[PDB]
Amino acid sequence: AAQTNAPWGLARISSTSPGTSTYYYDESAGQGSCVYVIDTGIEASHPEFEGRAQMVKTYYYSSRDGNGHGTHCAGTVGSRTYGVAKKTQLFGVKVLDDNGSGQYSTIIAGMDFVASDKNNRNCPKGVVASLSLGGGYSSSVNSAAARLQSSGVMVAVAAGNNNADARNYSPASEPSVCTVGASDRYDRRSSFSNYGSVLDIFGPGTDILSTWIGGSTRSISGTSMATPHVAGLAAYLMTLGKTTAASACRYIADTANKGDLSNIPFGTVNLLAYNNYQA
Numbered sequence: 565a566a567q568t569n570a571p572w573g574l575a576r577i578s579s580t581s582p583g584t585s586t587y588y589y590d591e592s593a594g595q596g597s598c599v600y601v602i603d604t605g606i607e608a609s610h611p612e613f614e615g616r617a618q619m620v621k622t623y624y625y626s627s628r629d630g631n632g633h634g635t636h637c638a639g640t641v642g643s644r645t646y647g648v649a650k651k652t653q654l655f656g657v658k659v660l661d662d663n664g665s666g667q668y669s670t671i672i673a674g675m676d677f678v679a680s681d682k683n684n685r686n687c688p689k690g691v692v693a694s695l696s697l698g699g700g701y702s703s704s705v706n707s708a709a710a711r712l713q714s715s716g717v718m719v720a721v722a723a724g725n726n727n728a729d730a731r732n733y734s735p736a737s738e739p740s741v742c743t744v745g746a747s748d749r750y751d752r753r754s755s756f757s758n759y760g761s762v763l764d765i766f767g768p769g770t771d772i773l774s775t776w777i778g779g780s781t782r783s784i785s786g787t788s789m790a791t792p793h794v795a796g797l798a799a800y801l802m803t804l805g806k807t808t809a810a811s812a813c814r815y816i817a818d819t820a821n822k823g824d825l826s827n828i829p830f831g832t833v834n835l836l837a838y839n840n841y842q843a
């Protein structure tokens with residue numbers, strides 16, 4: 565399958581070189597897999613989700629996405645026009661309020677919830693969790709992410725937007741999950757992107773067009789945008805049977821475009837997510 569005039573991020577992860585505009589992918593499109601989006605919620609009624617999204621848990625007064633952040637991330641995972649895995653199932657967990665903030669105790673509870681909730685969902689091809697959030701270092705938050713990964717879920721987390729070493733941020737600093745840096749359309753490290761030895765992979769993160777609340781769309785930037793590219797790619801690869809939840813991050817690194825990025829500090833991997841699609 566090919567999507568013409570795709571968002572540049574979708575074209576980039578299906579190509580070995582920058583500057584293309586077609587998203588090449590296999591028609592299975594991640595059907596049979598499930599992605600939990602742990603964020604501000606998901607506007608499940610958006611036409612771009614085609615009824616494949618639902619809220620399962622909120623820790624606030626409503627389950628509505630009053631911010632837009634979680635709806636944007638979920639759209640990059642698996643909306644029809646802006647998503648990597650266009651046929652996956654999307655589950656929303658609202659651990660952030662409508663200002664984009666949340667206490668660490670709530671974020672930890674949200675991760676423990678996903679580890680248990682997956683056992684009563686029909687996800688035959690595997691389960692993924694996308695966490696476009698973070699803060700200062702906390703061993704309790706890192707531990708919750710490790711538990712979720714250990715329970716059999718592919719955990720993808722943002723490296724953070726501080727232009728610093730991600731070792732001082734959580735859950736980005738947890739080694740056992742998949743920490744995602746951001747790049748721009750000219751194969752440069754995004755100027756805001758964190759770096760360091762804890763990073764596993766880079767994904768497109770600057771000027772990412774995706775769904776927004778009110779049934780609309782908009783373009784924003786962040787490692788929050790790179791993470792759902794990798795979470796979506798994981799579910800796409802799990803549906804194809806190429807990898808498992810326990811080894812998805814390593815498989816993606818092994819099969820990534822190597823050495824294409826510039827402004828990568830010494831000690832940080834130069835690896836860009838890539839789907840290796842061949843018609």
Ligand SMILES: [Ca+2]
Pocket residue numbers: 580581821824
């Ligand atoms: Ca290349």
Ligand SMILES: [Ca+2]
Pocket residue numbers: 738739740741742743762763764
């Ligand atoms: Ca890792």
